[PDB]
Amino acid sequence: IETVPVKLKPGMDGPKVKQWPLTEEKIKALVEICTEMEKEGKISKIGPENPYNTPVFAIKKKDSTKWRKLVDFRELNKRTQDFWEVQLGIPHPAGLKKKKSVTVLDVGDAYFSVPLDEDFRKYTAFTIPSINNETPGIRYQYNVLPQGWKGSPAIFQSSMTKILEPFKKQNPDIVIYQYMDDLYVGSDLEIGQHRTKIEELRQHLLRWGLFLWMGYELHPDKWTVQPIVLPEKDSWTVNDIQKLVGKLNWASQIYPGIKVRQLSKLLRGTKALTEVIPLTEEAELELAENREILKEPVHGVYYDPSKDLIAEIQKQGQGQWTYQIYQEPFKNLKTGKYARMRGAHTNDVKQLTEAVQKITTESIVIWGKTPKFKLPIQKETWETWWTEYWQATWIPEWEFVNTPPLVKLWYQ
Amino acid sequence: MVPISPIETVPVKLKPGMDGPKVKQWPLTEEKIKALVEICTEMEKEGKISKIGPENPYNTPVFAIKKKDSTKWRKLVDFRELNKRTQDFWEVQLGIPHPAGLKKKKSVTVLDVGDAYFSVPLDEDFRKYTAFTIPSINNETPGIRYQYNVLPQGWKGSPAIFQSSMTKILEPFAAQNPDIVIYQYMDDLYVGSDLEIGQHRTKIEELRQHLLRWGLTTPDKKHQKEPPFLWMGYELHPDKWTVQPIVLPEKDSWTVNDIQKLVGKLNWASQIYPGIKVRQLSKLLRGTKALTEVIPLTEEAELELAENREILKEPVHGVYYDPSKDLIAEIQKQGQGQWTYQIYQEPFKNLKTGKYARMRGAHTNDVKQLTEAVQKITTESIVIWGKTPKFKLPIQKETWETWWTEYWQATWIPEWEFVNTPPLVKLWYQLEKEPIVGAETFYVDGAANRETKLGKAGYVTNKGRQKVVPLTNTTNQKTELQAIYLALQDSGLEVNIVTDSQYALGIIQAQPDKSESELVNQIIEQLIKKEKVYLAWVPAHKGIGGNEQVDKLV
Numbered sequence: 028i029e030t031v032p033v034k035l036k037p038g039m040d041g042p043k044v045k046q047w048p049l050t051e052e053k054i055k056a057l058v059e060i061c062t063e064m065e066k067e068g069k070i071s072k073i074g075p076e077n078p079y080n081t082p083v084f085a086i087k088k089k090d091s092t093k094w095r096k097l098v099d100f101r102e103l104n105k106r107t108q109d110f111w112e113v114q115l116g117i118p119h120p121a122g123l124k125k126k127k128s129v130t131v132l133d134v135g136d137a138y139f140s141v142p143l144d145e146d147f148r149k150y151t152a153f154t155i156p157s158i159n160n161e162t163p164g165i166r167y168q169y170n171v172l173p174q175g176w177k178g179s180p181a182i183f184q185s186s187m188t189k190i191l192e193p194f195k196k197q198n199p200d201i202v203i204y205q206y207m208d209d210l211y212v213g214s215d216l217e218i219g220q221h222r223t224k225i226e227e228l229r230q231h232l233l234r235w236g237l238f239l240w241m242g243y244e245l246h247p248d249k250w251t252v253q254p255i256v257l258p259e260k261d262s263w264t265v266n267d268i269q270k271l272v273g274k275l276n277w278a279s280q281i282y283p284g285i286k287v288r289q290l291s292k293l294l295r296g297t298k299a300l301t302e303v304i305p306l307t308e309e310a311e312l313e314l315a316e317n318r319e320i321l322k323e324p325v326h327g328v329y330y331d332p333s334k335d336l337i338a339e340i341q342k343q344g345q346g347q348w349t350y351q352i353y354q355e356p357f358k359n360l361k362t363g364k365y366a367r368m369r370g371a372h373t374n375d376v377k378q379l380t381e382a383v384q385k386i387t388t389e390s391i392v393i394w395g396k397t398p399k400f401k402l403p404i405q406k407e408t409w410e411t412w413w414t415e416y417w418q419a420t421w422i423p424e425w426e427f428v429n430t431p432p433l434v435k436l437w438y439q
Numbered sequence: 440m441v442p443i444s445p446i447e448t449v450p451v452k453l454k455p456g457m458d459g460p461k462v463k464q465w466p467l468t469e470e471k472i473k474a475l476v477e478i479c480t481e482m483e484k485e486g487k488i489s490k491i492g493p494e495n496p497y498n499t500p501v502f503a504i505k506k507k508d509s510t511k512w513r514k515l516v517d518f519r520e521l522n523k524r525t526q527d528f529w530e531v532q533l534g535i536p537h538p539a540g541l542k543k544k545k546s547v548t549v550l551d552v553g554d555a556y557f558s559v560p561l562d563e564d565f566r567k568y569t570a571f572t573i574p575s576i577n578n579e580t581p582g583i584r585y586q587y588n589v590l591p592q593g594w595k596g597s598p599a600i601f602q603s604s605m606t607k608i609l610e611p612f613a614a615q616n617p618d619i620v621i622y623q624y625m626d627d628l629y630v631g632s633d634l635e636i637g638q639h640r641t642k643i644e645e646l647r648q649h650l651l652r653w654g655l656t657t658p659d660k661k662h663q664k665e666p667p668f669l670w671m672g673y674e675l676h677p678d679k680w681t682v683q684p685i686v687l688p689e690k691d692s693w694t695v696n697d698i699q700k701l702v703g704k705l706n707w708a709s710q711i712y713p714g715i716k717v718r719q720l721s722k723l724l725r726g727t728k729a730l731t732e733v734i735p736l737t738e739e740a741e742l743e744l745a746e747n748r749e750i751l752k753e754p755v756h757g758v759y760y761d762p763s764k765d766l767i768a769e770i771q772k773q774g775q776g777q778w779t780y781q782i783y784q785e786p787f788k789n790l791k792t793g794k795y796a797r798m799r800g801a802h803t804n805d806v807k808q809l810t811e812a813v814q815k816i817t818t819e820s821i822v823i824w825g826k827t828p829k830f831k832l833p834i835q836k837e838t839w840e841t842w843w844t845e846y847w848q849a850t851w852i853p854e855w856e857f858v859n860t861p862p863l864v865k866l867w868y869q870l871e872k873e874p875i876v877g878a879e880t881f882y883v884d885g886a887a888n889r890e891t892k893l894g895k896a897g898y899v900t901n902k903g904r905q906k907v908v909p910l911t912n913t914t915n916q917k918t919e920l921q922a923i924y925l926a927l928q929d930s931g932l933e934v935n936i937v938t939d940s941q942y943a944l945g946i947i948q949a950q951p952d953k954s955e956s957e958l959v960n961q962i963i964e965q966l967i968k969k970e971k972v973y974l975a976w977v978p979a980h981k982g983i984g985g986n987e988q989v990d991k992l993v
């Protein structure tokens with residue numbers, strides 16, 4: 028019934044982010060949603076004396092026909108004073124990534140039951156634009172904790188903490204982690220009961236006071252990881268050996284003990300690229316030693332909670348994508364490979380948008396935060412289309428790569 | 440007395456850390472003071488302003504300007520200082536409707552609402568900051584002090600507060616009368632509909648009745664304004680629109696400014712006049728920045744202008760949007776990185792047209808440019824119509840498929856169809872994915888001395904063919920490209936090329952079909968002539984034979 032006061036970071040004013048173009052379908056969806064939110068007292072119309080703004084759009088979660096409002100609070104979040112909670116900081120649960128099954132639940136609705144500090148409401152202003160700007164954009168601000176805002180989970184924490192005590196005390200082995208509007212629940216249970224605990228959990232939440240029916244299943248135990256592998260052949264051409272030395276030279280930046288001298292020797296002389304070269308024993312042994320080195324973990328690799336996570340993605344063709352997550356170059360914390368057919372047999376950009384959400388989800392589970400993406404696409408193309416395929420309630424940061432990395436094939 | 444609903448005031452504040460203005464009133468002539476006193480006396484009688492005590496410490500300078508040499512005077516309160524200290528407001532004026540997005544209307548009535556403006560009270564607590572002083576005759580008595588009770592003309596928040604206040608009043612009328620559209624511009628309301636005129640006039644009377652609930656009266660005359668309207672540079676007619684007359688001046692000599700003016704007119708014209716071109720005229724403005732500096736017109740530009748005068752020969756109109764039909768966007772390549780387009784619903788009846796120029800960059804290709812044009816049109820279309828048009832593009836479905844499946848970046852173009860109208864966009868070459876059996880293998884390399892700028896480029900092949908050419912005024916990067924060029928020049932129709940240049944590979948893998956570097960262009964011309972080319976990369980200084988760096992190490 029009371030609100031915890033909130034303020035912006037020193038020397039920072041509220042967000043003033045332009046609302047990007049919305050399709051007619053998304054505008055109608057938002058008008059309908061906000062009209063009901065206004066009636067329920069969650070948002071209120073605002074006057075011209077509020078110059079702030081945050082973009083809004085609409086999405087459809089994984090297999091749901093009902094539109095969901097999604098506010099892009101990325102700017103507000105970086106400007107809102109760090110809301111370290113009474114938790115002293117809930118240490119990210121390292122056991123979540125090790126569970127057999129993890130279901131993701133959207134509990135964002137709970138937030139709307141808690142009032143937002145009156146003096147901070149102005150900074151949550153947003154606009155529902157009109158097609159061709161024919162009529163004034165509809166302006167609103169939040170009266171309650173909004174979904175997608177950094178401070179919502181922080182402020183609702185204490186309430187969530189006691190809302191789950193029962194379930195948690197009766198199920199001390201189940202791991203429950205919260206990130207923004209999602210709740211991650213993991214357990215080694217047989218998928219059949221795992222689901223019972225989940226549906227039980229929400230029925231235990233719905234009864235406790237609050238579309239929570241949806242579920243997203245992940246399998247950390249069956250997750251993608253990749254070692255560096257060299258070809259195994261009976262006959263090597265000059266070209267095969269040139270490609271191998273190139274890959275080994277690249278790998279030597281990750282693994283110090285890698286050697287190519289003996290293999291390079293085979294390449295001395297101006298030979299036809301398709302000519303078959305028999306491997307000497309010295310070159311064969313060198314290749315063997317390198318294979319061994321490549322079976323050992325990378326040296327000096329560690330995660331630092333105060334550093335940003337970086338994610339790079341490469342289009343490998345035929346619907347396959349590779350990616351690496353690291354904080355320091357050549358010190359990969361996670362690498363993977365995707366090849367997926369949710370709807371984009373023929374759409375590069377949908378595929379990349381889905382790869383980005385999958386990687387972010389993995390990142391949240393493992394480290395409790397989102398990475399900064401380096402995307403292989405032109406900025407104009409990405410910004411024109413990503414919102415058409417987005418299905419997550421959070422949004423990571425991203426930048427663009429315009430020069431073809433030479434290291435594409437070495438990762439596939 | 441019939442009670443009327445008050446107009447809610449908007450709470451205004453000064454920027455944080457700032458106080459009100461304290462600007463000295465300027466000395467005026469006895470003549471101007473009597474005028475200002477008279478002027479302020481009625482304003483005061485009208486409720487606009489009120490006399491204030493000596494307490495108020497704020498001030499803003501008031502002036503008196505004669506009216507085009509009339510018998511009348513007019514007061515001007517200069518709020519520049521108060522404006523710098525007043526908070527920022529939400530300005531809903533940004534991004535005006537584009538005529539091609541409007542719907543045709545049978546009738547459009549105009550209503551003057553300038554009087555309603557003065558029923559909008561200024562926030563009581565902000566009034567004090569609007570204080571001003573009419574000096575006294577001969578400075579022998581205290582000047583007369585006043586503060587505003589209504590939105591002051593010239594004040595920063597007046598436009599936004601007036602508009603938002605009017606919108607709030609109009610809201611329920613618009614919502615309960617979906618068959619009409621209402622738009623406010625300046626002191627007028629424009630009301631349009633497709634109603635049988637009787638019903639349309641009834642709607643107008645109902646609006647006047649609605650406004651009276653706030654005691655806002657309207658002229659009860661026939662506003663001077665009637666279709667067509669001159670608005671934001673356009674002419675709006677009941678069922679068509681166009682830009683206001685575009686007149687290209689006749690000139691024997693042009694200056695930077697004249698050309699910037701010309702390009703401004705051509706750009707404005709390009710939204711409905713198809714084909715307009717501005718590249719040859721725009722490039723003349725490459726870092727001139729001297730308004731007066733007269734620039735000679737290249738014959739290339741003199742040609743572009745003549746072509747534009749032709750296009751502007753006669754009036755061209757666009758039609759309005761019909762929500763019930765599909766939107767089609769057709770694009771054509773014009774050359775020199777220029778692209779043109781038309782958006783229509785029915786053949787030969789454009790809603791609007793436009794153009795796209797390639798982005799600045801070292802290397803490019805037609806397929807990438809086409810893609811950027813498509814993305815630009817898509818976004819503009821979402822803004823104007825809220826949907827993506829179906830595209831008609833001069834590129835074969837097979838060419839597009841080869842391109843995107845092989846390009847290293849993710850790329851996409853929405854629903855489209857091939858339209859066979861030259862010049863068509865094509866892929867000019869395609870490198871091999873595997874080494875060519877039977878084709879000679881050229882190992883190339885180049886190097887340059889950073890100090891002397893002298894270098895060498897060359898190759899050695901499996902057949903014993905060899906070449907090294909001495910070069911001057913060069914760099915490592917240019918010698919690396921020269922080496923590849925020599926190999927292409929001296930090989931047959933199929934060739935394998937081995938290089939250690941990450942730079943050269945970075946360029947070729949980007950698949951340019953045109954470049955700002957003549958060297959890269961020469962290489963592109965050779966690739967186009969070959970039948971098969973495999974380009975292999977190897978690490979430098981790793982003892983890979985053929986890697987004949989030694990030949991170019993001197």
Ligand SMILES: Cc1cc(/C=C/C#N)cc(C)c1Nc1ccnc(Nc2ccc(C#N)cc2)n1
Binds near residue numbers: 542622669
């Ligand atoms: C933007 C706008 C400018 C003016 C005018 C401002 C001025 N001056 C008048 C109106 C009524 C509107 N609003 C809308 C909204 C939807 N369709 C239309 N179509 C439409 C408008 C004018 C004419 C005409 N003649 C024909 C069709 N107008």
